[PDB]
Amino acid sequence: MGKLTTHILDLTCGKPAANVKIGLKRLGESIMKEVYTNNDGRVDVPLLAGEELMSGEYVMEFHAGDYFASKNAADQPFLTIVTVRFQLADPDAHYHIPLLLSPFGYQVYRGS
Amino acid sequence: MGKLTTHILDLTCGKPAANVKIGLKRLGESIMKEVYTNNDGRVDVPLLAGEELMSGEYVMEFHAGDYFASKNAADQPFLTIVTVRFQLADPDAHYHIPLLLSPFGYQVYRGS
Amino acid sequence: MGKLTTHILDLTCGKPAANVKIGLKRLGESIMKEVYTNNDGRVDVPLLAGEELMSGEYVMEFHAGDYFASKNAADQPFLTIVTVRFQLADPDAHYHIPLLLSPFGYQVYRGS
Amino acid sequence: MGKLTTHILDLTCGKPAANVKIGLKRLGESIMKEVYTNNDGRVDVPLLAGEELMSGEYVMEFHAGDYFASKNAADQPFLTIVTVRFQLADPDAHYHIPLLLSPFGYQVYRGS
Numbered sequence: 001m002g003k004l005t006t007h008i009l010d011l012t013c014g015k016p017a018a019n020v021k022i023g024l025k026r027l028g029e030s031i032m033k034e035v036y037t038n039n040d041g042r043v044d045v046p047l048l049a050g051e052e053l054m055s056g057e058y059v060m061e062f063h064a065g066d067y068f069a070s071k072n073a074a075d076q077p078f079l080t081i082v083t084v085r086f087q088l089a090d091p092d093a094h095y096h097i098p099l100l101l102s103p104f105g106y107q108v109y110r111g112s
Numbered sequence: 113m114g115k116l117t118t119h120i121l122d123l124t125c126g127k128p129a130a131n132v133k134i135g136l137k138r139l140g141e142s143i144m145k146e147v148y149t150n151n152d153g154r155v156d157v158p159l160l161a162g163e164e165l166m167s168g169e170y171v172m173e174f175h176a177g178d179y180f181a182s183k184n185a186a187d188q189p190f191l192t193i194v195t196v197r198f199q200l201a202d203p204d205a206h207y208h209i210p211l212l213l214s215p216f217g218y219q220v221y222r223g224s
Numbered sequence: 225m226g227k228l229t230t231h232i233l234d235l236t237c238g239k240p241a242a243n244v245k246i247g248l249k250r251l252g253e254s255i256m257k258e259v260y261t262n263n264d265g266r267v268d269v270p271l272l273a274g275e276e277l278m279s280g281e282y283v284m285e286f287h288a289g290d291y292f293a294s295k296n297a298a299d300q301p302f303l304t305i306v307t308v309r310f311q312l313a314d315p316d317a318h319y320h321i322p323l324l325l326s327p328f329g330y331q332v333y334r335g336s
Numbered sequence: 337m338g339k340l341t342t343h344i345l346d347l348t349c350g351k352p353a354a355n356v357k358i359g360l361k362r363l364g365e366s367i368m369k370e371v372y373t374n375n376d377g378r379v380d381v382p383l384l385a386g387e388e389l390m391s392g393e394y395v396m397e398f399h400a401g402d403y404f405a406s407k408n409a410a411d412q413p414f415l416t417i418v419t420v421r422f423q424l425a426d427p428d429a430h431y432h433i434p435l436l437l438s439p440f441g442y443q444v445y446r447g448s
């Protein structure tokens with residue numbers, strides 16, 4: 001009954017980054033889910049929960065490039081697809097991993 | 113004559129993270145270089161420079177898991193191999209991309 | 225009917241930082257409130273809301289020093305009282321300003 | 337023979353933030369120095385060094401508000417004067433405390 005959620009904040013406008021594509025995939029595998037964030041910069045239903053979530057490593061592809069493109073950040077952006085690898089150990093624990101994003105930097109952390 | 117350098121800071125001890133393995137690879141490809149940081153938490157010679165550096169996307173595998181392991185952060189660490197994707201547009205420009213690291217979060221940015 | 229909330233994450237343990245003292249004060253003035261965070265690393269009731277909240281600058285004194293002291297980070301900590309100044313412009317808007325904390329660094333941002 | 341240096345990176349343009357005013361002051365006291373960063377986003381001569389530097393707490397007033405104003409971030413900016421308190425324990429040690437800055441967030445850390 002574990003859960004994996006996320007959250008994106010656009011540190012340039014100080015508002016949640018919405019409609020940003022998020023790819024999720026098991027380590028080694030290829031995309032298994034592809035979600036687009038809502039206005040609060042989240043996804044209605046967790047990226048993982050219950051049976052789905054299983055100890056091991058995962059990666060999330062935040063499509064920062066396209067996000068900033070829709071706002072402006074160039075024709076060959078420094079940050080294209082911000083990738084994040086991590087390992088969920090406890091299959092029943094909750095994992096909130098937000099992404100603080102800027103055109104030239106980002107914060108990856110385990111919130112709650 | 114461009115250049116790509118990096119730098120790792122252990123925000124838990126407030127000291128540069130040394131002997132942390134860093135894998136570098138072109139987007140799509142597999143490891144092409146594998147360096148271990150010195151005491152200042154850097155690498156004597158840039159990861160890329162001159163001819164080697166060529167516009168396109170690259171990924172860096174910082175081996176955070178093992179680093180914290182040598183200090184402590186568990187038997188199945190949240191952060192195992194912190195991965196970073198980015199795109200170098202100008203083949204002649206300099207790119208300093210440090211990694212501020214913590215057992216549960218990290219900052220990726222374009223310094224100088 | 226605006227609101228000002230906060231939130232503290234201990235990036236070293238990956239858990240919310242609780243019972244951390246938080247001083248709040250108007251720019252120029254002295255402490256006007258002093259709260260201690262609960263287990264989720266928040267405060268039951270916002271630091272400001274409704275009439276109380278008024279456009280202008282404010283400062284928050286997060287007592288990081290004592291927090292890490294209760295866990296370990298030294299006898300003369302680098303970070304003692306992490307201070308944060310900011311300006312609430314719209315008296316009716318919501319302001320969630322979390323603090324990502326580490327013994328040697330911290331992230332201050334406007335979440336939501 | 338200790339030293340205290342700083343450094344500012346504009347995470348929005350990915351370039352060092354220059355000509356940003358930096359106030360320095362002992363805990364309790366008022367401004368004792370006021371420097372403006374050069375193009376590399378640093379100051380030619382350290383904010384403190386040798387005899388000047390003495391164990392105790394200090395605060396730095398980065399004038400983020402005006403910086404972003406010269407680029408754009410509003411008529412009543414969220415971040416006006418980003419303030420940073422810290423404590424230098426060893427009078428002979430070096431302290432590099434960079435500031436990663438964004439219009440709605442910032443990273444404060446002990447680099448090297």
Ligand SMILES: Nc1[nH]c(=O)[nH]c(=O)c1N
Pocket residue numbers: 007098111230231320322335336
């Ligand atoms: N405080 C808080 N609340 C959320 O709902 N999401 C988040 O990311 C943070 N940091």
Ligand SMILES: Nc1[nH]c(=O)[nH]c(=O)c1N
Pocket residue numbers: 119210223342343432434447448
């Ligand atoms: N100021 C500074 N200097 C370096 O040499 N490396 C770095 O990462 C930063 N931020």
